[PDB]
Design a protein around this nucleic acid. Structure first.
Lengths: 120, 112, 96, 100, 69, 55, 68
RNA sequence: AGCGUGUGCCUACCCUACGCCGGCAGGCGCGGGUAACCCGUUGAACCCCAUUCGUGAUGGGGAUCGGGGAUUGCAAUUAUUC
RNA sequence: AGGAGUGGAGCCUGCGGCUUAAUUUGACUCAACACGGGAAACCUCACCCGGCCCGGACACGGACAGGAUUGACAGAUUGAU
């Protein structure tokens, strides 16, 4: 029932932000990630990945576009999206919640299995 | 690297070693072998090809490298030449004890 | 080996200008240092002179990481009737 | 002119012999010459394991490379310096001449 | 009272976004809701905190024997 | 895009950007004084370079 | 190695029968007509030509793709 | 204090005095050294002197864990390092 | 005769075991176990899940200048423009 927020600003305001102050709203590692340079060297995948986020169906649940990139900064442009991220074997489908901004897709997809021991 | 290159190439003529002597604006590398008539080839073809490959590999100015080949006396007192001779005698097909006795008798006939 | 015709020719008049050829065994290198005026990698040189070795016109030697090739008289004659040469030009390794 | 001649080599006996030859030439040419200044030597130590694999007692090798350097000053024009340095040079000794 | 902002144990909080030093029961409440938020978003850190293992990324083959019997 | 993806991974650093100048093995490199060999090739070729055992 | 999954194939390239004679049109009079487009770049002056697609015209190597 | 090391081959990546900004981690202009020449008279630690502490799992010990800020690198989440 | 200790406490690292798509592997008393100069985020990499190129020389027979063959932009498909 409560209204969701991230450093006090709202979701509509978070969509209506630019990257220059998104550095200061983000944390230290995420500001360095945005401030490294132009995203072209290894990040044409990141560019066209946000184009794939921008590509939208009609009023249903969005289609699950799947990735191989585990080091993505969660952006306000992809709130309420579905993505199946690679963990080595399968693609872990996940809802991008509006509490996750400032994280990585490699955190919500566990790579190893939970270990259940037996006998020596 | 130079000594390795010549001990791979000149395994037939009894290679021993190199001697690189430095001169103002000149480098020359003395080659001591056994068959000094065979290292040169016909009208010095092979020595010219060796100068050319050294100049093109080691990054030297053109015309600054001149190789010289000379023969050494007392072939039985060189360990590398007798080892190469025993290798050639075993590779052509011979008894190993026969070749070892022959090369040892040659070495002690050379005055060791 | 897919290879442009101009690179084959240019390698051949380099091989006939001076009767030796050297190359380092690496395939991920963009341009040959001696042919910096044009554009050809080391892979073309390695595979072309490997083909010419297999047809039997050069020697072969590997010291540390570099190649060493030496022309023979059948290789000389093959380059003389491949490059359309009148009988008056010889590589410098044969003359004094 | 302030002419400095630097000699750097690896052997010590041939270095001392060629330094004695140069100072003998400077003494017989009757000009002011500084003495053979002996810089402190430098050692190049490379310590490595003896075995190629990881089996055996932990034994290590100790390699060294001693480098000896001398410098002798002269008061003469340049042609005398070249004609006295290009006489009876040793193969294992480097000679290197500059002018300040 | 002229205390600089880098002397605080809770700088740039994830909910309200202001520098505020928190005290004992507030510290326990903030840590509890932070772990609850991590478990709700189901991150790797929240999953390791829920399981009760080492979360900072260190070797657990030998150290940490008194976790269970 | 094989011409662009053949060597697209950067090799400006790391131990795969270095290699021995004799056998080209990326293990146990000697980067002191620019020998750039492995330890076994250094022990093989140490005597004729000028390194001797005295200590 | 024959596996239970289906095996892919390289693209075989379809063979055209005398395509250059389809570019130049020869009528009964003394004139020559150019059906498809030409090349405007400085690398290829008048030599290579463009593709006859349904919604664009693609250059052979200069990549001057003009879409309608 | 004494052993050392220091601008590299295709090979890009050195050691740093001085001045300013910031608690600090760090950032920017300027110069030196291919070296008994510059870092550097290598103002190192343990020690010495003087306060605070007082036998208390304590100002011992710093494991575990949360938040923030910098640097390297194309990329750090399974926390690179600080 | 002694000194510092270790073995008990927390932590780093290596090995066995268990788990796992994979948790690559050699070494098991001295003479295996901060050993392979092995302080692996990518390369290392030799293990697993997926996709590109031939870097299959040379000889023989087909094949072919009326085309043996190389490369690619609109859009879908993964993972990759």
């Amino acid at each position: 029932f409560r209204k969701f927020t991230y450093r006090g600003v709202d979701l509509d305001q978070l969509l209506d932000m630019s990257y220059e102050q998104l550095m200061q709203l983000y944390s230290a590692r995420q500001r360095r990630r945005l401030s490294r340079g132009l995203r072209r060297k290894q990040h044409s995948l990141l560019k066209r990945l946000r184009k794939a986020k921008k590509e939208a169906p009609p009023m249903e649940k969005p289609e699950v576009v799947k990735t191989h990139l585990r080091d993505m900064i969660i952006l306000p442009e992809m709130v309420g999206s579905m993505v199946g991220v690679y963990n080595g074997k399968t693609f872990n489908q996940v809802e991008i919640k509006p509490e996750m901004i400032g994280h990585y897709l490699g955190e919500f997809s566990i790579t190893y299995k939970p270990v259940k021991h037996g006998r020596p | 690297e130079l000594n390795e290159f010549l001990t791979r190439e000149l395994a037939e003529d009894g290679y021993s070693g190199v001697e690189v002597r430095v001169t103002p604006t000149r480098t020359e590398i003395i080659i001591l072998a056994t068959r000094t008539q065979n290292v040169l080839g016909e009208k010095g073809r092979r020595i010219r090809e060796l100068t050319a490959v050294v100049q093109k590999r080691f990054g030297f100015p053109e015309g600054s490298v001149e190789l010289y080949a000379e023969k050494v006396a007392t072939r039985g007192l060189c360990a590398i030449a007798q080892a190469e001779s025993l290798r050639y005698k075993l590779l052509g097909g011979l008894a190993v004890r026969r070749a070892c006795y022959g090369v040892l008798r040659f070495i002690m006939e050379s005055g060791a | 080996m897919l290879m442009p015709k101009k690179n084959r020719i240019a390698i051949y008049e380099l091989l006939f200008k001076e009767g030796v050829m050297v190359a380092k065994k690496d395939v991920h290198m963009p341009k040959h240092p001696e042919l910096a005026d044009k554009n050809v990698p080391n892979l073309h040189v390695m595979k072309a002179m490997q083909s010419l070795k297999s047809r039997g016109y050069v020697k072969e030697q590997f010291a540390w990481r570099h190649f060493y090739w030496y022309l023979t008289n059948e290789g000389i004659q093959y380059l003389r009737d491949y490059l359309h040469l009148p009988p008056e030009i010889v590589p410098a390794t044969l003359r004094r | 002119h302030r002419i400095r001649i630097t000699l750097t080599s690896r052997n010590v006996k041939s270095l001392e012999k060629v330094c004695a030859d140069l100072i003998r030439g400077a003494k017989e040419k009757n000009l002011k010459v500084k003495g053979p200044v002996r810089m402190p030597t430098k050692t190049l130590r490379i310590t490595t394991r003896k075995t190629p694999c990881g089996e055996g007692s932990k034994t290590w090798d100790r390699f060294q490379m001693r480098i000896h350097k001398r410098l002798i000053d002269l008061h003469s024009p340049s042609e005398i310096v070249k004609q006295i340095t290009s006489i009876s040079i040793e193969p294992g000794v480097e000679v290197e001449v500059t002018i300040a | 009272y002229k205390i600089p902002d880098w002397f605080l144990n809770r700088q740039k909080d994830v909910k309200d976004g202001k520098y505020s030093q928190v005290l004992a029961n507030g510290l326990d409440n903030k840590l509890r809701e932070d772990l609850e938020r991590l478990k709700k978003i189901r991150a790797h850190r929240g999953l390791r905190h829920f399981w009760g293992l080492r979360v900072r990324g260190q070797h657990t083959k030998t150290t940490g024997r008194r976790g269970r019997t | 895009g094989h011409q662009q993806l053949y060597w697209s991974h950067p090799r400006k650093f790391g131990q795969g950007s270095r290699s021995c100048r004799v056998c080209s093995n990326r293990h146990g490199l000697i980067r002191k004084y620019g020998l750039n060999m492995c330890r076994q090739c250094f022990r093989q070729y140490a005597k004729d370079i000028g390194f001797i055992k005295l200590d | 190695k024959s596996y239970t999954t289906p095996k892919k194939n390289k693209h075989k390239r379809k063979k055209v029968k005398l395509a250059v004679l389809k570019y130049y049109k020869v009528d009964e009079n003394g004139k020559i007509s150019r059906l498809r487009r030409e090349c405007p770049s400085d690398e290829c002056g008048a030599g290579v030509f463009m593709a006859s697609h349904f919604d664009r015209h693609y250059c052979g190597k200069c990549c001057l793709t003009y879409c309608f």
